[PDB]
Amino acid sequence: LNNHDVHKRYQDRLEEDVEFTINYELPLSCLWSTIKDFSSDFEEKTEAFFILFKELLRRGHLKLQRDGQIIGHTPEEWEQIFREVWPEYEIEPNPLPGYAPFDIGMWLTVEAPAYAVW
């Protein structure tokens, strides 16, 4: 059964999310923000993120770059590239205790394999 249920539940809202977001120039951190209400569970959110990310790549306005140069990949490859380095947890604690953690929004803003460009 794995994650099939989660995929089914996300596919119920995919078209809605795409028709809202396809309209804007959103960085990946902002796509993450748009699916955060899907679930409180990090792995479920991660699954929703990738479903929306691949679909936006498929439609063609979302392109990705690193170091100012556009990089070409299939939606499937992009998903494999981001999963390979995806944070183990939604937050990483500050090595100085009690200080602000690093979150997945931040990771997508400064430690991602690639960045949205138009």
Add this chain to the structure above:
Amino acid sequence: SNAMRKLNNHDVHKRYQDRLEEDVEFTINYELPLSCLWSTIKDFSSDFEEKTEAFFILFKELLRRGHLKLQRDGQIIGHTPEEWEQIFREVWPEYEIEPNPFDIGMWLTVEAPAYAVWIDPEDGSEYW
């Protein structure tokens, strides 16, 4: 309350009016952080001043309609939409991207005067 800034930006203000509701609709729906309000207006113009003016119109309308409230250190501070605009304008970056990869999105994430709290239209619980 720079009347002179208002004079100079009247035209951008008028042009932004025709996408305001759509942008309001979008940001209310997903309860987006201020850094994503900036991303929402990005496509409006390639110009930094024009984008900044769009940002503040959207920001103020959300505050004015009571959808958005702003918090610092885990507590909401009460200001009028105009007061909050001035607080943000006073410290607003000079460039969309810091000269030399720091940008306005990042500033709105980690060094903003305050941070978004979304008030549910139905019965009024808060999303932090």
